[PDB]
Design a protein around this ligand. Structure first.
Ligand code: V7A
Ligand code: MG
Ligand code: MG
Ligand code: MG
Ligand code: MG
Ligand code: MG
Ligand code: MG
Ligand code: MG
Ligand code: MG
Ligand code: MG
Ligand code: MG
Ligand code: MG
Ligand code: MG
Ligand code: MG
Ligand code: MG
Ligand code: MG
Ligand code: MG
Ligand code: MG
Ligand code: MG
Ligand code: MG
Ligand code: MG
Ligand code: MG
Ligand code: MG
Ligand code: MG
Ligand code: MG
Ligand code: MG
Ligand code: MG
Ligand code: MG
Ligand code: MG
Ligand code: MG
Ligand code: MG
Ligand code: MG
Ligand code: MG
Ligand code: MG
Ligand code: MG
Lengths: 37, 177, 146, 214, 23
RNA sequence: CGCUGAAAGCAUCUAAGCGGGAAGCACGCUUCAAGAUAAGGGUUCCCACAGGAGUGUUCCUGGUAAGGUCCCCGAGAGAUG
RNA sequence: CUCGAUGUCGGCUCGUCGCAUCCUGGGGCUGGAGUCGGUCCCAAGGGUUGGGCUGUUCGCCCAUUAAAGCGGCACGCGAGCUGGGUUCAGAACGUCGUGAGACAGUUCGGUCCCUAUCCGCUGCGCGCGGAGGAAUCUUGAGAAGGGCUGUCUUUAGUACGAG
RNA sequence: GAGGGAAACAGCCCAGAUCAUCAGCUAAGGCCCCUAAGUGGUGACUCAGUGGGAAAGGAUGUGGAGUUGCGUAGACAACCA
């Protein structure tokens, strides 16, 4: 998982959600996992 | 809540007691109980179905509407049919055997065999040394039990070895090309 | 000359408040007012004219928002690394009397007389108190319109 | 909450034995004498489960009327010492019951509690292991000094708990996991493999090992 | 610095009217 | 890392909820501790003294009980206490 | 701000705190066969060696270690120590100046006091109170300490790998 | 250059102390308790303890106001070729 202040969709399958007050990007490909921080 | 606004059809032999905020569901397979969150109410709709109503079109009203609709439908479909989950193990040397409907023994390449106990509403059923299944009346409990069984040895991305879901799409790569 | 109370001239009574589902802030403000006797026309800052307050069901005090796990209470022993911190929810579960006393003391003036008056607050986490002999009268937290 | 067996005794001294592997073992000799249950504490009346034991030879003219009445209610002869044992099985103990060293077998692990030997006012170098200053190279009248005791204008103070000189010894010390070597109950002697706190003749509390064993 | 930032931000209080000695 | 699951007919560890999850947190182990003036609790012992003033007895003197101290012999204690 | 004095480098002693984590603990992604790694999330409980050179900090090196962390505290700590460096008067060299002399150039030598009043802190007593006076045994609100880690054996030459 | 406000706080805000007063009205600032006066009335917004510090940048947070494409010729999802 990448922890970055700037999280964006990288592929077309990545989905942006707000989990527990934090913006996250979830994707089938594990490389695209992201979390704001 | 497009899901919530759809009704819930009570099947034959299923007893649905709406005791205000607290609800009982009896059926052939067992008994389930649930409390709906307060700003959501449940009606019988001529005693042959179930309806859930959001008192306002806000966010929490609609969210709890859909949640409660899906969860009540889940309990009724469970008490009328149950919940089944198939888990298959791959990789040489890995085996599963049963000491009863609620007791599993796994040899997942560990130093020693590992023992798995089941909750009261969970019953195992093994048919093959490399395939088995879990059944119950609560979807959440069945799912979490399957998740724990998988967590015992999750599939790998090199030879798949590990407990995997029946339809699980396990990722894979190649190290020593 | 303005009136001034004389020692034991003002008769101190006993009230009991059921903290059942009552916000901690309202409970503490009401308790401080009663303990200092601000509801009496005979009030005087320099003479204790307040009443005894028995708080019951302090374990069921209502908290709004995420206070039960994010509103923290700190103590320091006075030596390096001597801080302990516990959330108000844990403190209400374990030692509700300490939580209510901390709130009321914070809301009460910083005085020797205030320290003396805070002893008049008897806080119990359960629904039962041992002061039946003192015969506390029920007190209802209310508001006066406009 | 924990069930503990216990007995009271006196530190008689030490000697040495040879075990079955021909190993030299230091043993403390404890006169784990007869103890009598003077009082049993129950949650109903006292709020916790514990057993008060007696033990000790006392002169009849040195036992006062309150103590004499306490022992008379206990139904036993007066004893010099009285020590409680926090056990969760206190009930199984009856008033005036007899307790002897045979409460411990030949290989039980025990915890021995006693008051350590006193040393008076000790320096930092002795009571805290402070390394002092050098003996030469210009050290000026501070060979056993504690060095610095703080910082500077911040915090312009000495932090609480700083280790400095003071009176060392005479304190409750429990030494754990000592394997009882032998028990001879007919004369009340216990041989415990190890060294226990306190001077010869001090009172010792021998309890079952809290951590069971190593 | 934190101290300087707090000193500058103290001027935002109600009774002061956006001004304060030493900013 | 999850389970169930909407808002958003799907999905989603989350919005309702539940589970795992570190030498860290709080316990467990050891020690101090009711000046904790909130001054605690158990058990046991001693007992309704005397004489004055008095202004509800109040309060002040005096001899004691249970008990303790001083003094003396010491150390397992200790600068002195 | 301090010139009717706030003593200035390094070591010694004693610590304490931060986490921007060196080791140990946990987890993701890996460009993660295994073995290992490298990233960056958690995490400050404990631990974090002895020497050669130099007044040194720094730095290099030797031998280890699970590791030899980075910083704050008047670049912590001289009414605690050290005086080797720095920054007094002596002297010499180089350079500069006609000269007296000068030099963040170098070299050898070179005085550093304090019986603790207050707070602070480590210990130890006396008093009074604890609604009668005592003797014994205690509860624990709360406080403190403690918390490190290696190697080998076995699982097993098992899993993995073409070896 | 006192008094009131700004937690404290020469330079900011209110206001220039002739003395007395156990009278009244106000300024700035305030009215749950500390702390004098409203846990004021009515309508919205926030759920971050934001309020009660901060940037480039980032984000299906949430309310409101537009413009515009498509849509019971049947839209967007979900489900069979
Ligand atoms: C190496 O740098 N360090 C820090 C300085 C220092 C170091 C060690 C010392 O031993 C002395 C000094 C300073 C000098 C100051 C002289 C001065 N005088 C020469 C004008 C003076 O003013 C007086 C006085 N009575 O006031 C003195 O004391 C004095 O003569 C003297 O002796 C001194 C010393 O002792
Ligand atoms: Mg030495
Ligand atoms: Mg000397
Ligand atoms: Mg100071
Ligand atoms: Mg800066
Ligand atoms: Mg999902
Ligand atoms: Mg999922
Ligand atoms: Mg001066
Ligand atoms: Mg961190
Ligand atoms: Mg450290
Ligand atoms: Mg910490
Ligand atoms: Mg260097
Ligand atoms: Mg440091
Ligand atoms: Mg310095
Ligand atoms: Mg100093
Ligand atoms: Mg020198
Ligand atoms: Mg010098
Ligand atoms: Mg020459
Ligand atoms: Mg010349
Ligand atoms: Mg020199
Ligand atoms: Mg001195
Ligand atoms: Mg405690
Ligand atoms: Mg205290
Ligand atoms: Mg002027
Ligand atoms: Mg002014
Ligand atoms: Mg002012
Ligand atoms: Mg002021
Ligand atoms: Mg007015
Ligand atoms: Mg105004
Ligand atoms: Mg004030
Ligand atoms: Mg209101
Ligand atoms: Mg309001
Ligand atoms: Mg925040
Ligand atoms: Mg904030
Ligand atoms: Mg911002």
């Amino acid at each position: 998982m990448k922890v970055q202040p700037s999280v964006k969709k990288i592929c077309d399958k990545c989905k942006v959600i707000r989990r527990h007050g934090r913006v996250m990007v979830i994707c089938d490909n594990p490389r695209h996992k992201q979390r704001q921080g | 809540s497009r899901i919530g606004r759809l009704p819930i059809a009570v099947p034959s032999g299923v007893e649905v007691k709406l005791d205000g905020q607290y609800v009982e569901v009896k059926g052939p397979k067992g008994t389930l109980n649930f409390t709906v969150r307060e700003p959501i109410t449940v009606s019988k709709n001529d005693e042959g179905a179930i309806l859930v109503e959001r008192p306002d079109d806000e966010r929490e009203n609609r969210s709890l509407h859909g949640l409660t609709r899906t969860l009540i439908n889940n309990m009724v479909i469970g008490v009328t049919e149950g919940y089944e989950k198939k888990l298959e193990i791959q990789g040489v040397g890995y085996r599963v055997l049963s000491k009863g409907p609620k007791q599993l023994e796994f040899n997942l390449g560990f130093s020693h065999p590992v023992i798995v106990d089941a909750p009261e509403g969970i019953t195992f059923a093994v048919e093959n040394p490399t395939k088995f299944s879990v059944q119950g009346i609560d979807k959440q409990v069945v799912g979490e039990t399957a998740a724990n069984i998988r967590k015992i040895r999750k599939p790998e991305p090199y030879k798949g070895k590990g407990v995997r879901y029946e339809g699980e799409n396990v990722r894979r790569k190649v190290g020593k090309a | 000359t303005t009136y001034s109370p004389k020692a034991g001239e003002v008769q101190r009574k006993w009230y009991v408040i059921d903290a059942e589902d009552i916000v901690l802030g309202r409970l503490a403000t009401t308790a401080a007012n009663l303990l200092r006797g601000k509801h009496k026309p005979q009030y005087a800052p320099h003479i204790d004219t307040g009443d005894f307050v028995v708080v019951v069901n302090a374990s069921k005090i209502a908290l709004t928002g995420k206070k039960a796990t994010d509103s923290l209470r700190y103590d320091h022993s006075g030596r390096p690394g001597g801080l302990r911190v516990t959330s108000i929810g844990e403190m209400l579960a374990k030692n509700p009397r300490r939580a209510v006393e901390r709130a009321v003391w914070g809301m009460m003036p910083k005085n020797k007389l205030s320290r003396q008056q805070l002893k008049k607050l008897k806080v119990y986490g359960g629904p039962e108190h041992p002061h039946a002999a003192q015969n506390p009268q029920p007190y209802e937290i209310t508001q006066i319109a406009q | 909450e924990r069930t503990v067996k216990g007995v009271l005794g006196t530190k008689l001294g030490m000697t040495q034995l040879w075990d079955e592997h021909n190993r030299l073992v230091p043993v403390t000799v404890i006169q784990a004498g007869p103890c009598v249950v003077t009082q049993v504490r129950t949650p109903e009346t006292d709020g916790y489960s514990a057993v008060q034991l007696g033990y000790g030879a006392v002169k009849a003219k040195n036992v006062t009327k309150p103590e004499a009445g306490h022992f008379e209610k206990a139904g036993v002869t007066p004893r010099r010492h009285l020590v409680e044992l926090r056990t969760a099985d206190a009930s199984e103990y009856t008033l005036g019951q007899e307790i002897a060293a045979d409460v411990f077998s030949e290989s039980d692990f025990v915890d021995v509690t006693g008051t350590s030997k006193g040393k008076g006012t000790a320096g930092v170098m002795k009571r805290h292991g402070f390394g002092g200053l050098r003996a030469t190279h210009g050290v000026h009248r501070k060979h056993r000094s504690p060095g610095s005791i703080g910082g500077c204008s911040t915090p312009g103070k000495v932090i609480k708990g700083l280790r400095m000189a003071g009176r060392m010894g005479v304190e409750r010390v429990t030494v754990q996991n000592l394997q009882v070597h032998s028990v001879d109950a007919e004369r009340g002697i216990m041989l415990v493999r190890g060294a226990v706190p306190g001077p010869k003749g001090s009172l010792l509390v021998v309890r079952s090992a809290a951590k069971k064993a190593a | 610095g934190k101290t300087g930032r707090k000193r500058r931000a103290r001027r935002k209080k109600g009774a002061n009217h956006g001004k304060r000695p030493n900013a």
